[PDB]
Ligand binder design. Structure first.
Ligand SMILES: NC(=O)c1ccc[n+]([C@@H]2O[C@H](COP(=O)([O-])OP(=O)(O)OC[C@H]3O[C@@H](n4cnc5c(N)ncnc54)[C@H](O)[C@@H]3O)[C@@H](O)[C@H]2O)c1
Ligand SMILES: N[C@@H](Cc1ccc(O)cc1)C(=O)O
Ligand SMILES: N[C@@H](Cc1ccc(O)cc1)C(=O)O
Lengths: 365, 365
């Protein structure tokens, strides 16, 4: 009945189209600058039609989704502003940054058009539409950044359009999105590339260095092999946030130099202990975690089948697990399994079920 | 038959004792400051006999292995020097740093006792003798740092003692060892802890960082969960090398600040391109100075029993899992479920076992 236009029919666009058709009877018209991709999307029933005219498809659309790169989306929003769109249209994107997009949207569309920025924290550009899946974004954070004027009810309509994603939707202001993604995603990319560059500089002086960088060092710097073109565009789009963070990092490295140079075993130990305790605690369940969840800690032995037996007991009781991880918080073979549940009642059933099987459990550690 | 003394019967010590007994009929006498550890080592046939006094066992030893922490080894070498050791004895350690150890050894033993420093580059999610394995060091670098006047014949005898490790032995000078390990192993550990500290500081201001930091960013900082006691001793023992590297790092971050602040897309792209090309050149699926993650990513649907089925498949193949997690922040990472293994062989078997049951899996490059 309703019409969706999808601009950029890759892995991300295609997976959104599949998530949408999962929960909605809609015609999806695909548009892509790479003709072969959209053709392939129509061949795979990811889209129902290929856009003959971009204007024509857009002017009949209830929903317009940009899955194009941020720089391309910015350019097309101008075109979108010159069209006569439906009164009820929702427009959204999938960009890794939101500041520049939302600046352009506010300048072009304010009050008239429901533009809501988006950022699904799953997927890649390493494959195309051939590997698209309705569940690509299942239990991924999906950040939405409504323009200042967009009523709460339009944001709920978009979450409804996208309910088939099974994403944890978070509504943030634009600055907050770029601030938080600057710290947890963009900044590590700068440091990963810097670590590789420092090893590369010394590799000239000793040939052993390239060989000893296999394994863990390669694993730690994984994100340094991501697209230089894409990451240079993100650094440009989030430049001011990253400049503030780099200046604070340099100050932190100068304090770390003073700690190391002082040789005080106490101070250095505290520095490693603080980092270990914070990292081990992630994610830190708080009051304001929008997806509210409930933790059970279980003492488990490091042996074949330990996790198999725990998960088998919870599955037989029809308890869904939202997350789990192992903490090395004991002395020998004993480890702690942290299990997260959506509902308090699931945690309670899990505690009872494991208690009857003679497991030690706790609700705080 | 020949006599081995093992001083410190933990993970690394115990694994060496098992690798020794694999290829040699010997009596191994265990000595440990924690009585229950060496008792447990005897219970597990890691050692043949226990000593609570060093002198008698050491004076009849053909081989003495220090697998105590480097600060403790340094202290015990004095005691060893006061004993009347065999003419043919070889003495070795397993310390992550070699400068301080070799300084103490050269002061105590020069031209008299065959002391050869050692550093097997292998790790574990665990400490303690119950996690010791004959195969811990297979295809790992094992660095030997002989004192200046140790006959090369004694280095060959030691490689023969330890042939059951299946390690790649390298003979290095002491300074070279601490310089190379400073760059490829110690310095990254400092930066991983620094990154955690910076994110922790901002999590105070926006508690959303405590939630969105559990996925991707956890990857570069995984090593920050390693032993603070061990890493504070390594930073102490390698202080001067790490001071020089921190000052270089600060200078590199200042140049990176100038690049980012100039906003030039070309220059920033070149910076990421150089890092990507160097990282892509590093060896594939090989052991280096930092233990590799051995991560397998698995596409699973959010259903009751999804983890039960995956863990059951791996347990039926007798594969031990070190860790697992559901990723909620996973841009550039296909596969919602991440599973970690002790070694590449386990990950390879896990990929085959899950493949046979029609699970899609992914490994990073
Ligand atoms: N753990 C690794 O990943 C790794 C890697 C390479 C090298 N190493 C080196 O090996 C050393 C041993 O590490 P591990 O991982 O086997 O630790 P561990 O805790 O498993 O074993 C160390 C053992 O030494 C004993 N010990 C401590 N002080 C002693 C003393 N004064 N006298 C006698 N025994 C004493 C402890 O009780 C323990 O059993 C580390 O300090 C490190 O320098 C470790
Ligand atoms: N090795 C266990 C899981 C586990 C891992 C580490 C531990 O410390 C404890 C348990 C399994 O395969 O099920
Ligand atoms: N709910 C699943 C685990 C799971 C959670 C989230 C996912 O996206 C996928 C799987 C179980 O109980 O086994």
């Amino acid at each position: 009945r309703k019409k969706v236009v999808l601009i950029g029919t890759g892995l991300i666009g295609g997976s959104l189209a599949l998530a949408i058709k999962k929960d909605h009877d809609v015609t999806i018209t695909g548009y892509d600058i790479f003709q072969e991709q959209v053709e392939r999307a129509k061949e795979l029933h990811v889209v129902d039609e290929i856009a003959v005219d971009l204007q024509h498809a857009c002017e009949e659309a209830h929903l317009i989704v940009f899955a194009s790169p941020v720089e391309e989306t910015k350019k097309l929003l101008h075109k979108l502003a010159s069209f006569h769109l439906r009164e009820d249209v929702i427009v959204t994107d999938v960009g890794s940054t939101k500041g520049s997009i939302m600046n352009e949207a506010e300048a072009l569309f304010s009050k008239e058009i429901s533009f809501i920025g988006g950022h699904p924290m799953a997927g890649s550009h390493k494959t195309g539409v051939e590997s698209a899946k309705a569940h690509l974004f299942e239990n991924a954070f999906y950040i939405l950044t409504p323009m200042h004027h967009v009523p709460n009810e339009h944001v709920e309509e978009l979450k409804d359009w996208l309910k088939g994603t099974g994403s944890h939707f978070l509504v943030l202001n634009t600055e907050e999105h770029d601030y938080v993604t600057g710290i947890v995603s963009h900044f590590p990319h700068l440091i990963a590339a810097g670590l590789v560059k420092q090893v590369e500089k010394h590799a000239g002086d000793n040939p052993l260095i390239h060989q000893l960088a296999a394994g863990g060092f390669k694993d730690i710097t994984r994100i340094a092999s991501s697209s230089p073109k894409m990451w240079s565009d993100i650094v440009k789009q989030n430049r001011e946030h990253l400049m503030v963070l780099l200046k604070e990092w340099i100050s932190e490295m100068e304090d770390l130099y003073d700690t190391v140079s002082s040789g005080d075993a106490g101070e250095i130990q505290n520095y490693f202990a603080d980092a270990k305790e914070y990292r081990d605690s992630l994610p830190v369940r708080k009051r304001g975690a929008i997806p509210a969840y409930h933790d059970l800690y279980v003492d488990v032995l490091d042996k074949v089948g330990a996790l198999a037996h725990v998960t088998s007991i919870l599955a037989r009781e029809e308890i869904s697990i939202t997350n789990l991880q192992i903490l090395e918080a004991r002395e020998g073979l004993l480890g702690v399994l942290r299990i997260s549940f959506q509902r308090e009642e699931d945690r309670m059933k899990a505690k009872l079920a494991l208690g009857e099987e003679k497991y030690q459990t706790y609700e705080t550690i």
